[PDB]
Ligand binder design. Structure first.
Ligand SMILES: OC[C@H]1O[C@@H](O[C@@H]2[C@@H](O)[C@H](O)O[C@H](CO)[C@H]2O)[C@H](O)[C@@H](O)[C@@H]1O
Length: 394
């Protein structure tokens, strides 16, 4: 009977309360939807195991590239009919340019975009003032300012890789991208030991050895990391859109910082093309489709209530008074969006291999190794390369 919708803890608990009410409001196709929260820790395995044992949902959000893995396994339901319905009802024309096309394959649309989770740098003005330093413009200035911030008891580059916390993972890849590197070649081949990647990892290790990265960062959960921001421990670091609201400190002291240049002049921001996906295990495919169209139509309410930690994929939402009046949001649009790249870099096309990269053990372990300075850059990257070859399909 009921359409099962699984959703992640995208922002604050209040995000899930609101998304629950939206979902449970669905009464289309003489059908209903149930809402269930899947935790971030081990999410890849949670979905993989549910789908394989036929106990998974009809519809879900989840990993940025998860839909490609399940499509390869033949467990996704293509979203072509949803796309048609959005064209008829008018919503399709409201999509931002380039947001739908990444999901088009030979066999259909694997999913529908719903938000863009971008990785801005943030700072706390009071702590930069206290340390007597300026906002970094590049890696060399990040390190200098970081040392001074450490000297006044602050964390110069806040991150975390504890259970449920993927921000550390994202930092590893963001810094590679920021130095003109990336996991892949232009043609989508693995290129982990590229020299720009080595430099990026050497820089992170230097932040770790100098105490600019907190020596316990490896252990920090999402709550731990948010608390560092809320309680004026974190001076600078990479997080998400809407950090003040996410951490419960809207004094105005926490502000978006400009992107910084790598040592060769490169600029990049990391972005995740998040999407809603439908599965073959549904009591009714028509109902899955109705639910998805209904849900996309109500998404504006989440940005209206300022409950999201991501960019919208709909033009009308990006023009909503609540969105543009926040200068942090405008700075992200203007300075991060134009330089944004995904995990596919230096390729562009998305694929199932991104699912294994994003959700798998190799990236997690690489991150924890770097954040503890357990080994040298080349060794860590070689272990990373090797782990990815074990799971990616060449
Ligand atoms: O790498 C796994 C997934 O990470 C998602 O980002 C999440 C943030 O939006 C949220 O605020 O924090 C959690 C826990 O750290 C993050 O995992 C990406 O948006 C996904 O695309 C990605 O699959």
């Amino acid at each position: 009977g009921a359409i099962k919708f699984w959703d992640m803890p995208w922002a604050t608990p209040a995000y899930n309360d609101a998304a629950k009410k939206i979902a449970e409001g669905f009464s289309g196709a003489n059908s209903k939807a149930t809402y269930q929260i899947i935790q971030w820790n081990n999410f890849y395995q949670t979905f993989s195991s549910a789908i394989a044992s036929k106990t998974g949902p009809a519809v879900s959000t989840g990993g940025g590239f998860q839909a490609f893995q399940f499509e390869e396994q033949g467990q996704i339901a293509y979203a072509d009919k949803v796309i048609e319905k959005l064209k008829s009802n008018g919503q399709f024309d409201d999509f931002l340019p380039g947001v739908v096309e990444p999901f088009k394959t030979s066999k259909g649309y694997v999913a529908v975009p719903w938000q863009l989770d971008i990785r801005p740098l943030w700072y706390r003005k009071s702590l930069f003032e206290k340390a007597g330093v300026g906002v970094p413009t590049d890696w060399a200035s990040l390190l200098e300012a970081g040392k001074k911030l450490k000297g006044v008891g602050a964390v110069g580059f806040a991150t975390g890789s504890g259970a449920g916390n993927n921000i550390g993972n994202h930092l590893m890849i963001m810094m590679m991208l920021n130095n003109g590197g990336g996991v892949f070649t232009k043609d989508g081949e693995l290129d982990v030991l590229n020299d720009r990647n080595v430099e990026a990892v050497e820089f992170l290790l230097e932040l770790v050895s100098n105490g600019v990265i907190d020596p316990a960062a490896v252990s920090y959960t999402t709550d731990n990391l948010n608390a560092q921001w809320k309680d004026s421990k974190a001076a600078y670091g990479m997080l998400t859109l809407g950090v003040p609201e996410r951490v419960g400190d809207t004094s105005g002291d926490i502000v978006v910082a400009s992107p910084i240049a790598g040592p060769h002049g490169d600029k990049a921001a990391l972005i995740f093309p998040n999407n809603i996906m439908m599965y073959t295990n549904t009591p009714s495919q028509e109902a899955s489709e109705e639910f998805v169209v209904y849900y996309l139509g109500k998404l504006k309410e989440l940005w209206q209530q300022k409950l999201m930690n991501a960019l919208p994929v709909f033009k009308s939402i990006t023009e909503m008074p609540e969105f543009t009046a926040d200068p942090n949001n405008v700075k992200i649009v203007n300075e991060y969006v134009p330089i944004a790249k995904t995990f596919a870099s230096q390729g562009t096309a998305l694929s199932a291999n991104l699912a294994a990269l994003d959700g798998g053990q190799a990236l997690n372990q690489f991150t924890q190794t770097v954040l503890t300075g357990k080994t040298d850059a080349k060794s860590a990257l070689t272990a990373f390369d090797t782990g990815l070859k074990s799971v990616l399909k060449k």
